[PDB]
Structure formats: structure tokens, C-alpha cells
Design a protein around this ligand. Structure first.
Ligand code: HEM
Length: 411
């Protein structure tokens, strides 16, 4: 099927997470063609398309997405744009820092921070969960990575990281805030990388700052200080970005009260199912870009070498073929469901060690579970009249008010 509009890029800006879905539904097909972001594109959705998208002998990420994305969210020529052994090699560096022990450490640091914040929250009239989450996550990420963070800069650094994330799907001022923040963060961290290499800043083996600073490539040389800052930033920024999920989770608890008592008398199992349903239900990761390496035929369609492709993440996560009542928030849908690396992909599909799948999934899950637990057992609060609406046409999305909590009290 072929969409002939000449304003698809603009249409994409207006539809956000619904661009692809609106069309895979209008053409009654898992894929379609279109001129987007200056190139010929094939958009596809579904778990099977996902399997094809993650087949590395047919798809490469090099030169896939616009530079405007590198200059804002990811950093220029970072791991997101790599392929082959070089990608795998650096991918192992990220994974070694995101294993169960690290996931555990971070969720526990987050847990002690949430508890310490209670004393402060009780005295406040209102609290904006999104802002609280940002600063706390930033403070934890840095501490855990071994990155020095002064009390008077937590706010600024936290905001810089968010400006980066909030700039990939926009034009105008939103994109510019990210375009300026990235340079401030990379510089801040590059000096750190350099002092560590000279032993002027204490670093600890096994921590992100250290590992990024001393990592060696396939040719045996270490990354340019700047690339090491970028790659370390590709660890700190994402963690801070967990803020959006934390807000969505709290919003799910408020929008679907029945589950509150459910989790409160349940265990780690209930929290795990609620946490998964939040990652599946709400929008965060839009879609991914890849480049067709060689000509191949799939689904009776021919993919020419060089054509660009977008894999719909939001849409696949809401595919009725995989999810009964996809558009309903139902944590119980996760009770006893054999794992599958392609049916749900809010943070990518496939194998993390074999492809570009997000290596921070475990951390994302454990931090959300820890944060959910805190909101369920540790405190009591009100959700005053506010705008909780979250647009599906804005990437990333977030409840307008950022989730405001008042009359907070320890439980
Ligand atoms: C907060 C929500 C998060 C979302 C929704 C998210 C989403 C994603 C997506 C969709 C990709 C691309 C997958 C692909 O290209 O196939 C990805 C990659 C990545 N994420 Fe996540 N992520 C998040 C959190 C985290 C955390 C907390 C960390 C660090 C602890 C992290 C580190 C990374 C890295 C390094 C990559 C690049 C991997 C590669 O290219 O091989 N992420 N993530």
C-alpha cells in the first residue's frame, strides 16, 4: 500500500504515536510505503514485523534516523547508530552495568530516597511527582554511577537530561532546549572522564563512570573522552527518563482504583504485573528506524536495499492479535504468560546481547516496582482537581499537570 501525501513528515508531527497505527488500520495492512523524513519509508507494525526488523542480516541502524535525533536524544555517533561486532562489543559494556545486582542496587537507593522525601512532602501544600522523580532519579543515577553531583546542580542537571528526551519528537523551542542541553551535559561529563583517566577523581571498578572511562574498543584503544561522556550520558539520561513511567504508574493507580487494594494485599507478583501493564499500556517509545541492508521479500512485499523502515512500538503493544482488549489497562492480563521477546516491545524487542534492544529494561522494571510499592504502602495522599490528560500526539507524552499530590501523609 502507498500513502501519496507530500506532508507525511508534518502529518507525523501532528499524529505522534498514532501516525503508523492510523494507517496500518486505514490500509488494513501490517505495512505501508511513504515519503517521510526526507526519504522513502516502509512503516510496519506487529510482532512478526518486529522479528523481521530485528533480523540483523537484513537491517542496519547506521544512517537510519535523522541527525536531529543524535544531536538531541542520543548524542552523535553513539551506540544507537552502530552495527556489527563493534556494536555488540560496546553493547556488552552497557549490559555489564545493568545486570540484576545493579537493578537491585538502584531500586534500593530509590527506595531510601522515597522514604526520606516523606518528611519533606508532608510539609508541602502540593508536590509534582514528575519533578520530584526527576531530581531523585538524577541524584540516584549519579551516585550509583560514581558521578559527582553537587546539591545546587541536581535541578539543572535533571532538567537538562529531560530537555534531551523531550526534544526528539518536536520542532521549534522544545527541540532547541534539547539542542542546548546536550552540549552542557557532554562537557560536564567529558571533564569528568578526563580527570578520572588521570586519577584526579576517585572512580570505582564496576561503576558506570569507571567502566565508560576505561573501556577499550575492538582495536584495543579507549573511546575519545567525548564519546565516553556521550555513552555515560546514554546511561544517566535514560534512568532519569524513568520519571515518565513513574507518573504513568501513579496515574494508573488513580484512574483504576480497584487495583490499589489488589496490590496492597498482594505481593511482588501483583506489582510486577501492574508494572508490565503500565509499560505496555501508556506511550513512551514511539517507533524505531532502520535501514534495509539487502533486497528481501517478506509478507509478499519486497524491501529494496537502502529503503528506510519504521517499526511501530506503540501499535504493536496495542495489537489485538496479542492482547485481549489491548486498549484497557488490565494488569491481570499478565498472570501466567510465557515470555516472548516480540509480543510486547515498549523498550524494543529481540535479544539485547544480539541487537539494539534496551539493556535498561531490568532497571526500569525494578525502579518502577520499588516506586509503585512506595506509593501503595508508604504514604497516603489526595489527587486534587488538575489536568491529567496525556496527548498521544506529543512525543514523549505525560499527564499535563505532571501528577499533583496534596495532603500527603505517612502510612
Ligand atoms: C525510561 C524508559 C525507557 C524507555 C521507554 C526506553 C526505550 C528504549 C528503546 C525503544 C530503545 C531502542 C531499541 C532498538 O533500537 O531496538 C532503547 C535503547 C537503549 N536504552 Fe532504553 N529505555 C528506557 C530506559 C533505560 C534505562 C533506565 C537505561 C539505563 C540504565 C537505558 C539504556 C538504553 C541504551 C544504552 C540503549 C541503546 C542500546 C543499543 O543501541 O544497543 N534505558 N531504549
Amino acid at each position: 500500500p502507498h500513502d501519496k501525501s507530500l506532508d507525511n513528515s508534518l502529518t507525523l508531527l501532528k499524529e505522534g504515536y498514532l501516525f503508523i497505527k492510523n494507517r496500518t488500520e486505514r490500509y488494513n495492512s501490517d505495512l505501508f510505503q511513504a515519503r517521510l523524513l526526507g526519504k522513502n519509508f516502509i512503516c510496519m507494525t506487529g510482532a512478526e514485523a518486529a522479528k523481521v526488523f530485528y533480523d540483523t542480516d537484513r537491517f542496519q541502524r547506521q544512517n537510519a534516523l535523522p541527525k536531529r535525533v543524535q544531536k538531541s536524544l542520543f548524542g552523535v555517533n553513539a551506540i544507537q547508530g552502530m552495527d556489527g561486532s563493534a556494536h555488540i562489543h560496546r553493547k556488552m559494556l552497557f549490559l555489564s552495568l545493568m545486570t540484576p545486582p545493579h537493578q537491585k542496587r538502584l531500586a534500593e537507593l530509590m527506595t531510601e530516597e522515597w522514604k526520606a522525601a516523606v518528611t519533606r512532602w508532608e510539609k508541602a501544600d502540593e508536590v509534582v511527582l514528575f519533578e520530584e522523580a526527576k531530581e531523585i532519579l538524577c541524584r540516584v543515577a549519579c551516585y550509583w554511577a560514581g558521578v559527582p553531583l553537587k546539591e545546587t546542580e541536581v535541578k539543572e542537571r535533571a532538567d537538562d537530561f529531560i530537555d534531551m528526551v523531550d526534544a526528539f519528537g518536536a520542532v521549534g523551542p522544545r527541540h532547541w532546549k534539547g539542542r542546548r542541553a546536550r552540549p552542557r551535559a557532554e562537557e560536564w561529563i567529558e571533564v569528568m572522564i578526563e580527570d578520572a583517566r588521570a586519577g584526579l577523581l576517585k572512580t570505582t571498578s564496576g561503576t558506570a563512570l569507571h567502566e565508560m572511562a576505561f573501556h577499550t574498543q575492538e582495536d584495543g584503544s579507549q573511546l575519545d573522552s567525548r564519546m565516553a561522556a556521550i555513552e555515560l550520558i546514554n546511561v544517566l539520561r535514560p534512568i532519569v527518563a524513568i520519571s515518565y513511567f513513574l507518573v504513568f504508574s501513579a496515574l494508573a493507580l488513580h484512574e483504576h482504583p480497584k487495583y490499589k487494594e489488589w496490590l496492597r494485599s498482594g505481593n511482588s507478583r501483583e506489582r510486577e504485573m501492574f508494572v508490565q501493564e503500565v509499560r505496555r499500556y501508556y506511550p513512551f517509545g514511539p517507533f524505531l528506524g532502520a535501514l534495509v541492508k539487502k533486497d528481501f521479500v517478506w509478507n509478499n512485499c519486497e524491501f529494496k536495499k537502502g529503503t528506510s523502515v519504521l517499526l511501530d512500538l506503540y501499535g504493536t503493544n496495542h495489537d489485538p492479535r496479542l492482547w485481549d482488549h489491548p486498549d484497557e489497562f488490565r494488569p491481570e492480563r499478565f498472570a501466567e504468560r510465557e515470555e516472548n521477546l516480540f509480543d510486547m516491545i515498549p523498550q524494543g524487542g529481540g535479544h539485547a546481547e544480539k541487537g539494539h534492544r534496551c539493556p535498561g529494561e531490568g532497571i526500569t522494571i525494578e525502579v518502577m516496582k520499588a516506586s509503585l510499592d512506595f506509593l501503595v504502602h508508604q504514604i497516603e495522599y489526595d489527587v486534587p482537581e488538575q489536568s491529567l490528560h496525556y496527548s498521544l500526539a506529543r512525543m514523549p507524552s505525560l499527564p499535563e499537570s505532571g501528577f499533583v499530590m496534596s495532603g500527603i501523609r505517612r502510612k
